[PDB]
């Protein structure tokens, strides 16, 4: 349950979701997930460079972004993306629990 592995899986989930909607013809929604992805990528780097403060900031800003998407993420569409996003949200809050 290492911080490093959890973060790696975040990058994977937000990749495959942005990738999915890109093929499905959703430019804005795929971009929004890729923006979360870019934050996750930046967390991975910030923490790696020995900066926990900015890492915690970027994580809490991701938890906020996820919640903002979840409220607009109505119904249960693709079983694939429903699980990948359920994973993504829970896991980011696991990193947040590993931080503070």
Q: Phi, psi (5° rounding) for residue 85?
A: -80, -35
CA distance 32 to 79: 20
CA distance 75 to 60: 25
Rg (CA), the chain: 13
- Of 59, 85, 58, 90, nearest in space to 74 by CA: 85
- Of 71, 67, 62, 69, nearest in space to 92 by CA: 62
Roughly how many angstroms between the first and final C-alpha of the chain, as a whole number? Answer: 16
Q: What residues contact 84, with CB distance under 8 A and at least 6 apart? A: 13, 16, 17
Spatial contact of 39 and 62, defined as CB atoms under 8 Å apart: yes
CA distance 41 to 61: 13
Method: NMR
Reading the block at residue 49, the tokens are 């460079």
- Of 28, 38, 99, nearest in space to 69 by CA: 28
């Amino acid at each position: 349950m290492d911080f490093t592995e959890r973060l790696d899986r975040l990058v994977k989930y937000a990749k495959e979701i942005a990738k999915w909607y890109k093929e499905s013809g959703d430019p804005d929604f795929a971009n929004s997930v890729d923006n979360v992805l870019g934050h996750l990528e930046n967390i991975r780097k910030a923490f790696k460079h020995g900066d926990p403060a900015r890492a915690m900031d970027h994580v809490s800003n991701v938890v906020g972004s996820l919640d903002s998407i979840q409220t607009s993420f109505k119904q249960t569409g693709n079983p694939e993306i429903a699980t990948r996003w359920q994973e993504l949200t829970q896991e980011v809050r696991e990193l947040y629990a590993y931080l503070g």
